[PDB]
Write a protein that binds this ligand. Structure first.
Ligand SMILES: *C[C@@](*)(O)[C@H](CCCNC(N)=[NH2+])NC(=O)[C@@H]1CCCN1C(=O)[C@H](N)Cc1ccccc1
Ligand SMILES: *[C@@H]1O[C@H](CO)[C@@H](O)[C@H](O)[C@H]1NC(C)=O
Ligand SMILES: [Cl-]
Ligand SMILES: [Cl-]
Ligand code: NA
Ligand code: NA
Ligand SMILES: [Zn+2]
Ligand SMILES: [Zn+2]
Ligand SMILES: [Zn+2]
Lengths: 249, 27
DNA sequence: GGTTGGTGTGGTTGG
């Protein structure tokens, strides 16, 4: 996260850290959507141009965390992966279309002050909240500048109109993506960055006061560049696939 | 269901330091 | 203690 700030304790209890065992390192962000399911970007698990192809046993999920590196005794829960499900139509060769994956945990995690799932949007929530100019919030332990934090970072950013998103890049944008960030002339700055993918773009519903995950940090070109915008997987667009996986498995 | 409500914030009727910026963006 | 025990030339881990 570039130009964000330290998150407050328990501010993003659905934040999950995808962790590589060997060597030990943070791979990506992710989110808790039930006591047994974690949502993330598929490129965090499969990306052949970077020789990336993780199997369940190469990974661990750490939930309830604040510090990037210290083991938070009795606060965080470390879970193993029973199964990974990548969207069948995830297009890594061209534009990361449908950059989304579900991970079923071996054992359900107990919720606590620091661990709780985020809501997934339904059609009314998506229609009402996903509008250009409305702000969502992005969290992550990714890089602080284009090329790092001691604790989880947070940044609020406005959803951008689709024509503007399209004209800001030569990468082919699809309806399974949306972009967010301040315009070349809005004064403010901020963006997600490498290391943040899988992390949630959330919005607080003014109708029922709950946080909803509308997006997943997916890609960008550099970080926080003037005129560029971060891109996010459109969670509601792929919700039928999310629900079919959860219902079935 | 039990999702999207934070024990240390909404449950205690406390706001985190910047959620207000989000709410204002709706208006 | 702490966002948490009982003890660290820490530990699955800083000070
Ligand atoms: C995997 C994630 O941590 C990362 C998130 C980047 C978010 N950036 C901004 N500014 N909000 N995603 C990536 O690094 C993805 C994975 C594939 C490469 N990529 C990019 O975002 C390249 N920078 C652009 C790109 C290359 C090929 C296909 C699509 C996008
Ligand atoms: C990824 O690796 C797993 C196990 O190594 C294998 O079953 C699968 O075929 C691979 N998928 C790829 C490289 O697309
Ligand atoms: Cl490999
Ligand atoms: Cl290899
Ligand atoms: Na920008
Ligand atoms: Na200690
Ligand atoms: Zn290899
Ligand atoms: Zn099973
Ligand atoms: Zn609860």
């Amino acid at each position: 996260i570039v130009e964000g700030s330290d998150a407050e304790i328990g501010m993003s209890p659905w934040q999950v850290m995808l962790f590589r065992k060997s060597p030990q390192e943070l791979l990506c962000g992710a989110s808790l959507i039930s006591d047994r399911w974690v949502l993330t970007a598929a490129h965090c698990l499969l990306y052949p141009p970077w020789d990336k192809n993780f199997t369940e046993n190469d990974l661990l999920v750490r939930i309830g965390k604040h510090s990037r590196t210290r083991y938070e005794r009795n606060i965080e829960k470390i879970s193993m992966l029973e199964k990974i499900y990548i969207h069948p139509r995830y297009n890594w060769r061209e534009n990361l279309d449908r950059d989304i994956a579900l991970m079923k945990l071996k054992k359900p995690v107990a919720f606590s002050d620091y661990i709780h799932p985020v809501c997934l949007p339904d059609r009314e929530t998506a229609a009402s909240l996903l509008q250009a100019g409305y702000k969502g919030r992005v969290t992550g332990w990714g890089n602080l500048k284009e090329t790092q934090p001691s604790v989880l970072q947070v940044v609020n950013l406005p959803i951008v109109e689709r024509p503007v998103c399209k004209d800001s890049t030569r990468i082919r944008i699809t309806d399974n993506m949306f972009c967010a960030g301040y315009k070349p002339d809005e004064g403010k700055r901020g963006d997600a960055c490498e290391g943040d993918s899988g992390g949630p773009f959330v919005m607080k519903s003014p109708f029922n006061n709950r946080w909803y995950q509308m997006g997943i940090v997916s890609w960008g070109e550099g970080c926080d560049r003037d005129g560029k915008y971060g891109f996010y997987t459109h969670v509601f667009r792929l919700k039928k696939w999310i629900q079919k996986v959860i219902d079935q498995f | 269901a039990d999702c999207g409500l934070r024990p240390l914030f909404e449950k205690k009727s406390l706001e985190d330091k910047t959620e207000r910026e989000l709410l204002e963006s709706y208006i």
